[PDB]
Amino acid sequence: IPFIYQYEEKENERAAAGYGTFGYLITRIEETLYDQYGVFYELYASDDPNTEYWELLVEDVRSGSLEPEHVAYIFEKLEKKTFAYDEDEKEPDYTVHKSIRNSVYAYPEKGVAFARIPYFQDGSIMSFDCLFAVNDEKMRAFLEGVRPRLWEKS
Amino acid sequence: NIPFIYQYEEKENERAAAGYGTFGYLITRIEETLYDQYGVFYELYASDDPNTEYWELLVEDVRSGSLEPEHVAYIFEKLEKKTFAYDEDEKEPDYTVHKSIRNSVYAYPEKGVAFARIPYFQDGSIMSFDCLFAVNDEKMRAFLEGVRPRLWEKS
Amino acid sequence: IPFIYQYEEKENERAAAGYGTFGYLITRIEETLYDQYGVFYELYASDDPNTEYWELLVEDVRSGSLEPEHVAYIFEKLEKKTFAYDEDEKEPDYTVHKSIRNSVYAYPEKGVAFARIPYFQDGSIMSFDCLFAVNDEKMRAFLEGVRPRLWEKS
Amino acid sequence: IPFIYQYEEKENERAAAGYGTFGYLITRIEETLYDQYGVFYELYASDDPNTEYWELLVEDVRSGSLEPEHVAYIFEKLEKKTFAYDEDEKEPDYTVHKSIRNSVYAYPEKGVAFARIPYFQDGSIMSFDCLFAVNDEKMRAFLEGVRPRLWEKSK
Amino acid sequence: NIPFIYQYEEKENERAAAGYGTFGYLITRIEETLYDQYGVFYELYASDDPNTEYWELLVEDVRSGSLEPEHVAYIFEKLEKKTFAYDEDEKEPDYTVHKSIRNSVYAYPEKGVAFARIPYFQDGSIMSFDCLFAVNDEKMRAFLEGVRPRLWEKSK
Amino acid sequence: IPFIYQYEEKENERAAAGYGTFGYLITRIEETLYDQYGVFYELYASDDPNTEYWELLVEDVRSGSLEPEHVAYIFEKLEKKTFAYDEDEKEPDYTVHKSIRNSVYAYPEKGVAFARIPYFQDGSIMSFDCLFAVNDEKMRAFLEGVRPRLWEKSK
Amino acid sequence: NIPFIYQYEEKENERAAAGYGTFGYLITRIEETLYDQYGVFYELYASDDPNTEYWELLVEDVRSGSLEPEHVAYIFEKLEKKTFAYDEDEKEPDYTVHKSIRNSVYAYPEKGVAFARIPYFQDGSIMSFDCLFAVNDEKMRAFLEGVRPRLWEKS
Amino acid sequence: IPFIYQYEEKENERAAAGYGTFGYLITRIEETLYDQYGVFYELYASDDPNTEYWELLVEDVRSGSLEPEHVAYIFEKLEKKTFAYDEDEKEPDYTVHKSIRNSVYAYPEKGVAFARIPYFQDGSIMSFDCLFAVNDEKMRAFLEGVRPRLWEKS
Amino acid sequence: PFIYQYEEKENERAAAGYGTFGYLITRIEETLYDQYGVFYELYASDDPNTEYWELLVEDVRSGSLEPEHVAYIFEKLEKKTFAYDEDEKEPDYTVHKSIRNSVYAYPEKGVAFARIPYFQDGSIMSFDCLFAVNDEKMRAFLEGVRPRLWEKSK
Amino acid sequence: IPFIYQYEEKENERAAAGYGTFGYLITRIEETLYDQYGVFYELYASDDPNTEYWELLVEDVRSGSLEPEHVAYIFEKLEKKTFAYDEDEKEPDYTVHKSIRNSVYAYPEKGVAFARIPYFQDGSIMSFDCLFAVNDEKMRAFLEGVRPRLWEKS
Amino acid sequence: FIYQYEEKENERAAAGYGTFGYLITRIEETLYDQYGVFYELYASDDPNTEYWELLVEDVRSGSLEPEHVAYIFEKLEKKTFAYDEDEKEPDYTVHKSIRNSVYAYPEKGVAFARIPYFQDGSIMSFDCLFAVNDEKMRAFLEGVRPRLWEKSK
Amino acid sequence: IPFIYQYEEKENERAAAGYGTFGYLITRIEETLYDQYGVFYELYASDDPNTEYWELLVEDVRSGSLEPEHVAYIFEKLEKKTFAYDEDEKEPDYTVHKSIRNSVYAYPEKGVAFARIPYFQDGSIMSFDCLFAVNDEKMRAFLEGVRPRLWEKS
């Protein structure tokens, strides 16, 4: 019945750790997706653990494919463009494309969107891999369509 | 009278427990919300649950549209609200889309138990506390006793 | 002769980190023990690495023994009760008892008190194992009794 | 559907952690190059994992080349010169050149700029390798020239 | 005349060195208090002593009730003021309950040496700066000379 | 074309972590070296990975040589003296000298100043190995003289 | 016709695989022993079973004196013929002496299956193969189906 | 001019380690494939570190596909059939299939043969992954056809 | 048919280590019969349990007449030993009979112990074997371990 | 002064282990190159730890280059062909080329020969990297042209 | 019983015990012939280090205390040195080899032998300890720690 | 009092494994050194854990220094020459010299000989670093001069 801890918290201490940044960014990404397309997008994965559709996004931006449509940049002074030169790679590639990290990339055809949101920690720049969809059935179309898109490339 | 080197009297602002502000806010609000929906008082039985089996079963039931799981509420407004089962690691393919487990307050009402995967940002990466709630101890004991046969049912 | 560093101390910046939380809890534990048991309890192990008599406490709370007495809860909105179910157990235990973490237990006859103080750091919630006692010889009697109690119960 | 969390995000609490310094530094780098070269460079790499063209940069500055031009120093009281003494190296090179870390170097004809931004983390001093460029074709030519320049260096 | 990217002149509050404020407040008062007990000015000779032998011998002496290690003070009030030496893993335990090594200032007044295992909190757990004090260099060396003589004398 | 994050960052957010102490300390170490030696000194390594000439310093202070000279102590209440005992070594060294950490040591003839700045990561007492010099040829002459000095120590 | 460096030609002994002789002798003799006891042909299906569930079912059945499993024979003469279930770690001290699992062949003649945990010497400590047998796969499929219902009643 | 070690050794210690076992098995598999299909086969991969086309053979024999054909069993007293029950997967997969290990399987029209040869070492029984083919032309098509079926199956 | 068609000679049928193990176990059983008149049999071949093995070394160290020293396994290996553990602050100078390379027996309890030395790796390790007259003598002995552990503790 | 070990090591026991096989293969390889190139080749690396000139060889055979010439196969029943497929690699390659393992290759103008001698250890199949050269100048010339060759493909 | 192969007497041989038995028998035989008393094994691979260090230092300091009895292997090292590159203060004393040698403290009734063996090629050493009677062994172990204290002074 | 082990070893069974080849190599190296320098060399380090003077041997051989003199080669078909190429080192040496491994060298004035005997174990070529000398005083002088040489070269 008695409680050792009787400290009265200030309301600011009830704030979550970092949810303000994530919230403002998610709100503005959804808002801008609507600004361009007029649709109500929604978050579906916070730190996406799946790589196949993300490597597919990378390939589609590199090849200058039609519908992988850059929407906006997350942070202004982080990288706006990037290259694909890996010194380890046996045969180098020199494609200079727009940045995957720090950019919002929407497939409006498949009603889906992707985000690679930077954040600073441990003396390095790290990436939140977020996934967006205006409605469930379109997301369900994209996830179904991932393996077909691979089969054509294969 | 033996003396003390550290003669500074620490302040009340400096007695604040690290992390308990947000955790207490969220647990109290989950308690209040569960009371508003199911007119009963739930209380914490686990803070971060090392066990996974019944947690797995909650996910499996929400995936298979099972009746007993019920989605009480969402924890964070701008965080995830749905999720998918697609695991590229697994050879077997499933593409089912359901509501989220993380950021979701759930309740088995007949069984008298409640589940929550409270998200939190630590070192950037998103992690979750698996919190388990119950009304009375007999309800929780019945749930734990029935969890292990449900595995037989699935298998 | 001279010194390179020449910055004053407001003494606001002279305060130790973590002692404020530890001091409030330790003092309120000692106070709460006085209100219930009118005698003075003192810290003897801040983070007791000895797991044997802590194991014995948990089994006594499982068994329903009246020897351990639940004096108070440490945090209001942390676990007030727990269970002994673990997947890995070949023979499962379903006993639901009061929590060990977030609780203070005092053996009144032996003059010894246990406090498993929760703390949120990094990955999860973790627990300080603090051990209190009224006088030195009661502590000695408890420790010598530990190992007999260990092999009597088995 | 209501939400469990209801706290009000403040405008000071909406800030990103550590971006204000990285952005400030990057902005001041881009402002410095324009005040000296009349053209707009942009960030094409933040923390650069690639090493080969960075080692060609340090080789150029060590070798008294005029190809990289020192533009500015990032921090005033950090290292402003350096040397190349490794005890494990059997034959020591004692060359004293200008700093690579804490310095911004530029290849004006190639259109590519280099920056090694220092920072303090868990004690030790580390560095972000930043890479700048006027335009994409400037970058593609630089990347295409890295391995050829290495072939000449080995010849 | 080379430009500088970083142009931010800091207020005085943020040139502060983290941790030195607590350490300095502690060291000053340890030296101050060690004057009132033994009337001698004291000085730091090891800030985080990495050697273990003579610190281990301090525990044996306090465990034995030896008259020479004398308890100057406790560092933090609400931390441990006593401790014990039971080891579950040790095949034959020792149940001695003495005064806490951590959180205490102990001084060998004749040898002109003082020991301080200062507590501090890092990553949750409680950790201890082992700080070594002395009055002058010749006494310190004399004590340092005495470690191995004092070490195997006890074995007898 | 547009930007998602649009916080009007306040000027305080432009500060860099750890620089305030480094800038103040490096500036004052420089000021001190001019006052007692009449020459301007500058940083050549902020955290020196090298160990050989740093080890030579401690033997010069341990042997009371003219070669080093104790300019000042960096922190008031940290070690102003130290000792060289190591339990693991069979043959002991009981020499008590002055502190390497918390001290500024200058070779006034060679124009090279050493500083081992202590810092608290809160976790422990760690040290930055800074190296100062007046000019590049004085530095080059020191780096070359290290190994002949080491060969003389061998005899 | 191109050359080959290895013109050496193998003794017929070197054709022999390492370890198969002992494993084959045992499998042959275990089969023959199952053939003489139950008059039917029993054959191998698992050579080192990675599945623990139906093997720990076997242990408890033997421990509980259950009539369901029968003990066909012993692998080795001077190895263990009996055993106990005492685990110092367990707070529940079990003092039951039953026939050994290792060095023993067990069989459920009802279900048309046979169990053999064959002991082998390697690197000092004794280790064991867990080999599974069955008359025909039609019999085995029912047993594999039957594992989960039996594991259920214990739950 | 001189040499320290002057020991003369004839053909008897010129033996390589383990090749005698590998040679006898490889020679007989090739010969047995010749008697069944009339076409000389040859080894192209010894211990195939790749996994995905070997999963195909696993699924084919289990799924009762007539793509594989059982050429022979390698060892007489090792397993001739196996099963797929595993604790991790909630799916029981009680399917009783012919053994992948200890069996030589060949896709005769595709000209590619498989063999998971077994060996006893480290106590545990382990398996080589030898891959046989007749001509380099068919082999190239097989590798290029392996990536389709992974995307086709899903 | 079967790829492998080499017929084993009988020498290849043998098992590594069992020949020595069987010889030693047989002769231990023979030696115990010809001293105590009762047939002993193996109940554990490499006992992982340690509680009653520790009690045996102390009974031998205490000069206790409870355990009876029956035989030595290897002629020229150790026949005496000491417990000097430099790690401990208390050096023990007690010279007791060797646990390793010896066969002990509790005739009343009907249980025997053997620490059989084997030369493998570099160092010398040991098999710890348990023997017993019958099942009930074993069960009674096994249950007496926890009582005797309580006495030595107090 | 005496000697404890009075056993004169027996003649059969004096030979070393592995040199008989290694000596056979090197002697046969050297002889093989003498007929094929009319010059004496000699060993310069017995277990070559270097990777750069070995990774260039496999690319040379892969590319169909005319510089490297196949001399002989080491073991008859091991691989005589292989493929460069790595399912891990994002850049797929399905080339079927001659085997580097089990083969002796030579750069006859450059005066350097390579041999990847296969051996069986602890189950898996492994390789000895052996390098031959006609004279030191040839070796110094090959070594000085390795790194320029590496930057040529990029 | 499943396994019915009857092992030959040669098959019953225990690996390693032949060499260990030969070496132990010869060491004890030499000890008897030189000092007239029967020595016997008290440690076969002594995990302890202190008194072994005492032997090494007694030979390094050329004390007349330990007597060199024998060399175990003819072609292995008969001499050795104490240079350790990692030790800052280097001792260049060249003493006789501890490994490959049998040394005895004849009054103290104790013998030491560091027998070399080759495993994975690399040469390692079995430390073996011998004594005439248990009481002499007790006395030696008793004096071990005071010997360290004396070296400390 | 009894002994369980009742098998009497034969003389072949007494063999210390490895001492035969090691003894042949040491005896032959000693004899060759006697024949070349008319003096008697003797082993002073069996498996030298020290690296400094061996690195100095490598330096002197690389620079053709007159002080080390090649005495013999250990194995006939092993490498007689070697190179000093390391990809890991940014600036590389291409020098081709006589092999340190498989060779016996000797500093004839210092009275100290070096040998690096190769051996084949578990699929790897490894090296016993053996040190030889005529008298202890010359060995002492060499060890004393080690560090001087070390910073003489630098």
Mind giving me the DSSP string for J37-78? HSS--EEEESS----HHHHHHHHHHHTT-SS-EEEEESSSSS
Sheet-wide strand order for K67-71: K40-43, K123-131, K110-118, K101-105, K67-71
- Contact (CB, 8 A) for H70 and H153: no
Pair of tokens at residue F15: 């500060």
Out of G17, G81, G97, closest to residue I42 by CB: G81
Q: Using CA atoms, how far apart are residues D83 and F49, in angstroms rounded to an integer?
A: 12
Tokens 């310094």 — which residue? D21
- Interface residue ranges in chain G relative to chain K, Cβ cutoff 8 Å: 25-26, 29-30, 33, 73-77, 105
| D82 Cβ contact list (under 8 Å, min separation 6) | D96, D97, D98, D99, D100, D101, F44, F45
Q: Using CA atoms, how far apart are residues L54 and L115, in angstroms rounded to an integer?
A: 10
Q: Provide the residue range defining the domain that includes G124.
A: 20-154
| D123 Cβ contact list (under 8 Å, min separation 6) | F119, F121, F126
- Contact (CB, 8 A) for F66 and F60: no
* CB-CB under 8 Å, E151 with K152: yes
Q: Does any domain span residue F36?
A: yes
Q: Using CA atoms, how far apart are residues C120 and C127, in angstroms rounded to an integer?
A: 9
Cα angle: F66, vertex F67, F71; to 5 degrees? 90
The phi, psi pair for E107, rounded to 5°, reads -135, 130
Q: Do chains J and L touch (3 or more CB pairs under 8 A)?
A: yes
Local structure of residue D119 (DSSP, 8 states): E
Q: Do chains E and J touch (3 or more CB pairs under 8 A)?
A: no
Which chain J residues are within 8 Å of A89, Cβ to Cβ? 91
The phi, psi pair for C106, rounded to 5°, reads -125, 120
Instruction: Determine how β-strand I111-119 pairs with β-strand J103-107.
Output: unpaired
Q: Using CA atoms, how far apart are residues K67 and K96, in angstroms rounded to an integer?
A: 11
* CB-CB under 8 Å, K118 with L122: no
- Contact (CB, 8 A) for H113 and H107: yes
- Contact (CB, 8 A) for F116 and F129: yes
- Contact (CB, 8 A) for B150 and B61: no
Which chain G residues are within 8 Å of H124, Cβ to Cβ? 48
Chain L nearest-CA distance from H75, in A, is: 27
Measured CA distances, G152 to B148, E17, F143, G60, K75 (Å): 8, 64, 77, 14, 69
Local structure of residue J14 (DSSP, 8 states): G
* CB-CB under 8 Å, C45 with E22: no
Give the end-to-end CA distance of chain K in Å, rounded to a whole number: 68
Which chain J residues are within 8 Å of L76, Cβ to Cβ? 23
The phi, psi pair for F54, rounded to 5°, reads -65, -40
Pair of tokens at residue A54: 């993300």
Q: Does any domain span residue F8?
A: no
Pair of tokens at residue H45: 């991969």
- Contact (CB, 8 A) for A154 and A137: no
Pair of tokens at residue H153: 């199956």
| L23 Cβ contact list (under 8 Å, min separation 6) | J9, K73, K74, K75
* CB-CB under 8 Å, H6 with L73: no
Q: Using CA atoms, how far apart are residues D127 and D112, in angstroms rounded to an integer?
A: 19
What's the full length of chain A, in residues?
154
Q: Which of D89, L85, D91 is nearest to J145 (CA)?
A: L85
Measured CA distances, B112 to B107, B108, H97, J69 (Å): 8, 6, 45, 77
| D19 Cβ contact list (under 8 Å, min separation 6) | A75, A77, A78, A120, F5, F9
Q: 3-state DSSP call for residue J121?
A: coil
β-partners of residue A132 are A43, A113
Q: Where are the alpha helices (DSSP H) in chain E?
A: 20-38, 53-63, 137-155
- Contact (CB, 8 A) for F98 and F81: yes
Chain C nearest-CA distance from G70, in A, is: 24
Q: Using CA atoms, how far apart are residues G47 and K87, in angstroms rounded to an integer?
A: 55
Measured CA distances, K102 to I149, J4, K24, K55, K66 (Å): 42, 9, 11, 11, 10
Q: Which of D72, D145, D154 is nearest to D113 (CA)?
A: D72
Burial class (CB in 10 A: 0-12, 13-18, 19+), L3: middle
Pair of tokens at residue K106: 């004849």
Give the end-to-end CA distance of chain G in Å, rounded to a whole number: 69
- Contact (CB, 8 A) for I108 and I114: no
Q: Do chains C and K touch (3 or more CB pairs under 8 A)?
A: no
User: Between K and L, how many residue pairs show a Cβ–Cβ distance under 8 A?
Assistant: 94
Mind giving me the DSSP string for chain K? ----PPPPTTTTPPTTHHHHHHHHHHHHHHHHHHHSS--EEEESS----HHHHHHHHHHHTT-SSSEEEEES-SSS-SEEE---TTSSS----EEE-SBTEEEEETTTTEEEEEEEEESSSSEEEEEEEEESSHHHHHHHHHHHHHHHHHHH-
β-partners of residue J127 are J118
Out of L46, L52, L143, closest to residue K77 by CB: L46
Which chain I residues are within 8 Å of H29, Cβ to Cβ? 3
| H54 Cβ contact list (under 8 Å, min separation 6) | H48, H114, H129
Pair of tokens at residue D149: 């320049």
Q: Using CA atoms, how far apart are residues A112 and A43, in angstroms rounded to an integer?
A: 10
- Contact (CB, 8 A) for F42 and D81: yes
Q: Which stretches does DSSP call E strand in chain G?
A: 43-46, 70-74, 82-84, 97-99, 104-108, 113-121, 126-134
Q: Using CA atoms, how far apart are residues H68 and H60, in angstroms rounded to an integer?
A: 7
Q: 3-state DSSP call for residue L138?
A: helix
Q: How many CA atoms lie within 13 A of H124 on its CB side?
A: 6
Chain F nearest-CA distance from A134, in A, is: 18
Q: Which of F80, F70, F84, F78 is nearest to F119 (CA)?
A: F78
Q: Which stretches does DSSP call E strand in L24-148?
A: 42-45, 69-73, 81-83, 96-98, 103-107, 112-121, 124-133
The phi, psi pair for L106, rounded to 5°, reads -155, 130
Which chain K residues are within 8 Å of G30, Cβ to Cβ? 2
Q: Does any domain span residue L9?
A: no
Q: Which of K92, K98, K88, K102 is nearest to K30 (CA)?
A: K102
Tell which of J94, J122, J127 to mutate to test the H interface (max H CBs under 10 Å): J94
Instruction: Determine how β-strand B43-46 pairs with β-strand B71-74.
Output: unpaired
Helices C136-153 and I135-153: crossing angle in degrees, nearest 10, is 180
The phi, psi pair for C120, rounded to 5°, reads -95, 110
Pair of tokens at residue E7: 């142009």
Q: Does any domain span residue I62?
A: yes
Report the run of H or E that residue B73 belongs to, with start and end: strand B71-74
Burial class (CB in 10 A: 0-12, 13-18, 19+), L118: buried
- Interface residue ranges in chain L relative to chain H, Cβ cutoff 8 Å: 24-25, 28-29, 32, 72-76, 104
- Contact (CB, 8 A) for B19 and A15: no
Q: Does any domain span residue F128?
A: yes
β-partners of residue G21 are none
Q: Using CA atoms, how far apart are residues C106 and C42, in angstroms rounded to an integer?
A: 12
Q: Using CA atoms, how far apart are residues L103 and L117, in angstroms rounded to an integer?
A: 7
| D8 Cβ contact list (under 8 Å, min separation 6) | none
Mind giving me the DSSP string for chain F? --BS------GGGG--TTHHHHHHHHHHHHHHHHHHHSS--EEEESS----HHHHHHHHHHHTT-SS-EEEEES-SSS-SEEE---TT-SS----EEE-SBTEEEEETTTTEEEEEEEEE-SSSEEEEEEEEESSHHHHHHHHHHHHHHHHHHH-
Instruction: Determine how β-strand F96-98 pairs with β-strand F103-107.
Output: unpaired
Q: Does any domain span residue L24?
A: yes
- Contact (CB, 8 A) for H74 and H118: yes
Helices K134-152 and K50-60: crossing angle in degrees, nearest 10, is 60
What's the full length of chain D, in residues?
155
* CB-CB under 8 Å, A47 with B79: no
- Contact (CB, 8 A) for H98 and H81: yes
Q: 3-state DSSP call for residue A145?
A: helix
Chain B nearest-CA distance from A10, in A, is: 8
How many structural domains compose chain E? 1
Q: Which of D155, D149, D78, D76 is nearest to D107 (CA)?
A: D149
Give the resolution value in Å.
3.0
Which amino acid is present at H153?
Answer: K
Which chain J residues are within 8 Å of A92, Cβ to Cβ? 154
Q: Using CA atoms, how far apart are residues C77 and H111, in angstroms rounded to an integer?
A: 69
- Contact (CB, 8 A) for J95 and J132: no
Q: Does any domain span residue K2?
A: no
Q: Does any domain span residue E9?
A: no
| E150 Cβ contact list (under 8 Å, min separation 6) | E54, E57
Pair of tokens at residue B64: 């298979």
Q: Using CA atoms, how far apart are residues I77 and K44, in angstroms rounded to an integer?
A: 7
β-partners of residue J87 are none
Q: Do chains F and I touch (3 or more CB pairs under 8 A)?
A: no
Cα angle: B38, vertex B40, B45; to 5 degrees? 110
| J8 Cβ contact list (under 8 Å, min separation 6) | none
